[PDB]
Design a binder for this molecule. Sequence first.
Ligand SMILES: *[C@@H](C)[C@H]1/C(=C/c2[nH]c(/C=C3N=C(/C=C4\NC(=O)C(CC)=C4C)C(C)=C\3CCC(=O)O)c(CCC(=O)O)c2C)NC(=O)[C@@H]1C
Length: 156
Amino acid sequence: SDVEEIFKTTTQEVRQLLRCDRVAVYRFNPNWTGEFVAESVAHTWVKLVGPDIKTVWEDTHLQETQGGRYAQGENFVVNDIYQVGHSPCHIEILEQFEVKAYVIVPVFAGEQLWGLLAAYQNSGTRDWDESEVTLLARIGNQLGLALQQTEYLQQV
Ligand SMILES: *[C@@H](C)[C@H]1/C(=C/c2[nH]c(/C=C3N=C(/C=C4\NC(=O)C(CC)=C4C)C(C)=C\3CCC(=O)O)c(CCC(=O)O)c2C)NC(=O)[C@@H]1C
């Protein structure tokens, strides 16, 4: 799968586009277990996707709801995870990644929702601007097209 290389080089660019620290690719497996296939993070932090690589995130919330609002292709922007009035758990994990805000856009590739595209930036208690959110989703879907193209070519 050389297409991953294409993702690697682009994920680093979109990372700078939204002035983010790290940008993760979250794929939905047949069991919706939450597999991270790749992430572009500054060398100043832990890469995460290195020792184990397979970073699973079993979010029973999104699993039971089959993606929830994300299933309808709706994006979500969190300017701050605390101020939003969120419930316990999920937040504890995010705080550990040195992040307090993020943006989630849906990436469709193939027949269903392939995965989500999230970008985080050193806490970042700022407002996610329209210019950033809409471009992130655009590139996300754009990358999914490369997945389709490669699947069409059937790289063997
Ligand atoms: C402990 C209680 C378990 C848990 C519960 C829980 N989750 C949510 C809400 C959300 N879960 C996600 C999932 C993700 N966010 C990411 O950045 C990633 C990596 C890409 C994943 C997998 C999301 C986005 C939400 C918010 C959107 C939504 O609600 O659909 C809640 C509600 C309160 C909250 O939003 O924090 C609860 C109670 N979460 C876990 O991770 C534990 C398994």
